[model samples]
Target: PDTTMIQKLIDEHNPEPLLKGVRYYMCENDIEKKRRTYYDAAGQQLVDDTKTNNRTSHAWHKLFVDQKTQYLVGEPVTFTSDNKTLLEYVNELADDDFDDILNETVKNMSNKGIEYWHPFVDEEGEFDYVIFPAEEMIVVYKDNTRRDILFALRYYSYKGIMGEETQKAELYTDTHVYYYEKIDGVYQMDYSYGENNPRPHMTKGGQAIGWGRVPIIPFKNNEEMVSDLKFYKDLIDNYDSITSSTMDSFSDFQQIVYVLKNYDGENPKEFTANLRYHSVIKVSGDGGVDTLRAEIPVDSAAKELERIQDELYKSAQAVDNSPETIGGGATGPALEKLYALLDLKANMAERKIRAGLRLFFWFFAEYLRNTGKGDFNPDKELTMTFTRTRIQNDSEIVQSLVQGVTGGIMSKETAVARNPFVQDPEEELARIEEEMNQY
Candidate 1:
């Protein structure tokens, strides 16, 4: 069988959605993705499926022959113009796909790429397989103009793909994909990452793809979870996903920069951005590698939150089987501190992304209280202050400004859109309403 047979097989069985977890598992995360998942790409799934199955006289040739495989043809799918933004949008749409399993897998997928080896047994006896999951796709746009944008939440071993050269049987972990829509076209294609096309998993083989084979769970309403990707500052949740707790915990260490009390160094261009009050570490130079450091007194924020939680616990009394205080046992002064800590976490995330330096909030707040004139334009002041430092990137810092101090530099509409602030006001308002309506 040739590519035609592979295409025929696909047409016959209509295998699972390439994006589904099972399909991802089948290929073992190699080939395609960054390189693009071409038809009958050589990978682990190809090797194993061919070898293990007792269906054909020449197992290796049978699998290699592509009789069972399907050749996915046509103009390479055209994706949306705004690649990154579209991914963010799909994340929201497929948010509920795998539930707990997908979240756990995402935890492992965000780390920096590194090489490792593991041993596996085969007819040729035991051998090592090289494994690693790289950040799959920077951008992807399918054939159809509309539903093209997507971002990989993670890859499932059971639902992924793999590729191996003829000589080398060792498996290589490749990129895994997150599927979504382009649902408008192709009432039913091999896969539909986004909308409509039901029966996502590959039927041809029992192989898993990244969250593939998702049943028809149509939505009553379609809304864009993320409209723009430019304001793509990293999220607090991303830190937890990408880095380890041990790495962030050390921020508990403290430091004091000794300088003149009235000291104002060469008015560095005032790019007043916040670093979440804590959690961000800075390297003095060279790709942020000069030093291993974080904002001083970072651990204090966590401690303060713990204290608030304790106080709330002490004050709480059971009523109608529910604890009086929300957040279990955190409220009042401590809770305020927690909010501040959370605010700091959000700011620091953008900083780690190398967005820009800004007027520290402590100073900004003090500047407002001490001075009678309230005309502090954070962006303008930042531009003036950091006049000497080359303006590499300042939008992130400006965004932070928009999120931090209420009405100074950014309007409420825009401010509400950044970092954690996106959910802040509504959450607070809802809490207040719940409290008032408690009786």
Candidate 2:
């Protein structure tokens, strides 16, 4: 019912049962689809019976996860602060290394339904962040306020006695509850002891202990995001079966297609039908010849398989950019309509990402303030822009840019930025200005 319940469970050594279930289901789905050759119900490679041409379309599931990650976080996230120094600090916090964490965080959301973020300073005293596996982190909320997290715990495995793997849990141990708010408001580095070992020593950036807020942030992938592969798991399995069956049919046909009937009845063992090059097939009783051939509908199987693939992608809301879809040369509105479902999902995903980002920056600003960086305001306006993959006609875009620039509505630099061909818009504009000055 409350954080008290959390403490009771922790005292019993039980935490995050529901989140553990989510991780279990997602990881099982991944093994089946992505890992391909895994131990099945019976044993290893039980699905295909000794791996005789295992046709698995893992790309289908991979495409969905990667596409969402790329679309949601492919471009740089925009950050704004009340002052230049704060803005610079914010930029430093979200540099290239941080991009990897953000990218994996979104990917985990898509694959595992939820993701966790941990912020701290390292041994060298540099601010940093990491994305934790959802299975390892748990959040406990205070009474009467669902949004306020009273404490957080992360479980991880390390080498215990004799270098064997052992599990340990770290509880943030809300300092506000133990230490007086006004008198002992700042976090102090303290460690609790057990019989012979330490009980969860706090990591670096001991200041985070007294921040009165959870340093970890959790985010969901979508409105109804559970496992990204659950919906299409069966579809992909069926598609793989169809592909394998088709290949097997062709292989059987190639090896032995026709059976030569021996109606002569006189020593039928003498009859042979080895249809190899320069090989003779002869029967002598009555010069009788009859051949029974097994025919497989390869075209029908292929068509049905293609239909199932289409349905799989449709149900998953993933855009299929196969040769058939892209080779058709879709442009502008055509391409937009093709990506309608994906775009809608992207919109929902963006909403969740923005919510998580807001929470992250709030904690980030607090961390800075607590560590003597600055008293930066986190409520300042921040903008996030995602660059979607779009097919555009360069000539038409150039014409529109020209019109906008001539009308004084847009700057030349902005036009250059908008231009698809210009890789570095600022440099392009500067070079053009230099050429103009020379004239």
Candidate 3:
């Protein structure tokens, strides 16, 4: 699968999550039922297949019914003293389909006002109730398989109805998942997959993780959920105006897709196999068989990096008449240590460190080379490992590590240039720990 087609298909069908703010949909029983059949059955069924005793509609009925000939699109953002108007605005969007019924409810419930998150509160000081947007989504099918289906939706509007004495700051995540065909197109559902044959014996839902349907929320409403997305978009555009930034509005994520494709292959299944089957080292430590932390191989890049730090410190000291500092004046050890570093195999660790530093520098250098435009404030070094404890006691080992790390970050260049978001990592370990603490 050239799979490049996949990107085009994704662009054409599924766009971004429509962050259109809060939206509501009074569930249509018949449409909802049909949709459930299309998705829950695991795949699309033929017209005849859906005609089963349990089925409600065949293919044509499924497609033709509720087909979107026109979509209610607007940007009528407003703030009104009376809540009734906001409800009316929402109802007007639903005019032909759900407008009338929705309007009546809006008039009744939003008469006074609809507080943003707290909808309606009591006379004294508490909230009586509130109204929130709901969704009505449909599954568009190509064949008898669910994977061939496209999910379309109309984002419910969320114009707040603030009553007297009620306050409501913007309390809605924008619904960004919307695209019109000729004018405003239908919103499309997007999906990605992971596969392991004789599947990677992982567990979820009391079953192996890969055995069941991949768990996708398909829709979510949270600032953090898409924070990285917005941040990266802003960054890539140099924080260009939102208007100019909207150009790649949808294509923004393709960079990540390209990266994943390059590293993991088009098929994630193959990538997993390559990961496990590759000649990767797996370290195991046992009290009797394993030496202390000091015994592990020091000839690696880490040791070299340490030596480089010392060397840079020496260089800095020679230049500045200050205590040995490498990265522009952070005290490190002597560069002689870098010269003396040697591996068990007799390879010089100094050369290793030099190479490591060069590669480390190359990351930012290469990026700058490609961009040929961005400002270059290169950080030559990055933290490879960190040790933290709540005890706040500086044990001997910790003391030595502190000395080394302090030298690395304060004075070393290698730690400065690495990109934590790309070349380095996403700080997953810290995230896992934070999440665990929450639990």
Candidate 4:
């Protein structure tokens, strides 16, 4: 929460990566690219593009980002344990929209490639989290390992009393958060906000329990922390350009070049204007008018468009849930095959999220300990499980689990593994044993 530390972090902050993330998320891509020039065929610089800028773009980033986000967080994640205190604390967090916040924060991570959640106490002695997107915050880790955050800088802008813009910054340390104002070029600590200038991440049962870590949790989109947008950015641009140019070709065809043989008319423009205006052409009595046109290679373009889309979806690891692939009444392994790539991507997202959640609990448990709650070991006591959203044939899966075991053809382990509703296979087995104990 030191002013000097805040200034250093601010100076080192970079906004371009997050800006690019937002750029692609909004589908503002190469559609803004414009370089008009005439070009001849044979792959020469004289290549003039067909007129009609049909800048239609399919948002591949949104498709991929939301795909993984919803795929991983579709159903609420389960944090399992018999610890009463831990369960109550987790239930409290869930009641405070913790699940919803975490779900939306996953979307933020997928876009910016990483995101932060600041946990603190509110006025009513309730614990809550605020998302600090990678665009607006920077976390400095101790020893540069990124394992433990030394401090963080969360900055934002606001319109002042006279509609003038003001840049404000919040410096977050392990125990306190300080407010700052950007004065000319210096980050002066501000104390006139009426609230506490440097305050504990606080008011636990209406007061503090001696917080010991930075009040922020960092979540990574993937281990590499690469934005999903960057993977298919170029491919989507090509797809947009190709499909749009194809549309341009069709519209350009509407400009049927009329050749006047042995005709003396006003000019080419006048004749075309009259022809289009009234679908009537008045030609010289001595001449005949004819339409000279070349048929566009539509089939080839369509083929190329399909090709590019395939590569785009593959590169982005997104499913093309276009009813065609996820066919009518498709069940069992058929749906799995269709969603294989999507599942592959969702696995990585789930893995990264589990790691982030571990860190969250480590810090949360510390808060609980400080609040006089019984000691909780997140790693040793709590088991995490993710339930992925999927299209399912309920009867088919139920039959497989029950009938396969009854027929003695499938092991209970495999049946449970194949059970679509089972969020955690091992936990299900352990509980199944508990149910069998009556015998």
Ranking of predictions according to lDDT: 4, 2, 3, 1
Off by over 4 Å in 1: 1-135, 144-332, 335-340, 346-439
Q: What TM-score fits each model?
A: 0.17, 0.46, 0.16, 0.54
Task: Give the clashing pairs for model 4.
Answer: 39-46, 39-47, 39-48, 40-46, 40-47, 203-207, 204-207
Model 4, TM vs. native: 0.54
Best by TM-score: 4
TM-score between model 1 and native:
0.17
Residue-by-residue lDDT tens digits, candidate 3, 97-181? 3333322332223221121121221232221233333232232332345663332222333333433333222111111111222
Ranking of candidates on TM-score, top first? 4, 2, 1, 3
Model 2 bad stretches (over 4 Å):
1-57, 60-78, 83-85, 88-211, 215-349, 355-399, 402-439
User: 1-439, model 4: which lDDT tens digit per residue?
Assistant: 3357656765566755555554544543443343245655655654236432446557654455555665565455344333465568566664246565555544444444334546544444344445444434566773355778665666766676447887766555555544445554334434232245334455444555445556555555455545444445545655666566656655664666655564545576886676588776556765555432132454576677778667755764334564444354455545544553356557656654766666656655665565556756555665443333222333466666677656646555555654334545566566567768956
TM-score of 3: 0.16
**Candidate 2: worst-modelled 10 consecutive residues by lDDT:** 176-185
- lDDT of prediction 4: 0.53
Q: How many backbone clashes does candidate 4 have?
A: 7
Q: Superposing all C-alpha atoms, what RMSD in Å does each candidate have to the true structure?
A: 29.7, 10.9, 31.8, 8.8
lDDT of each: 0.28, 0.47, 0.28, 0.53
Q: Which candidate do you rate higher for TM-score, 1 or 4?
A: 4
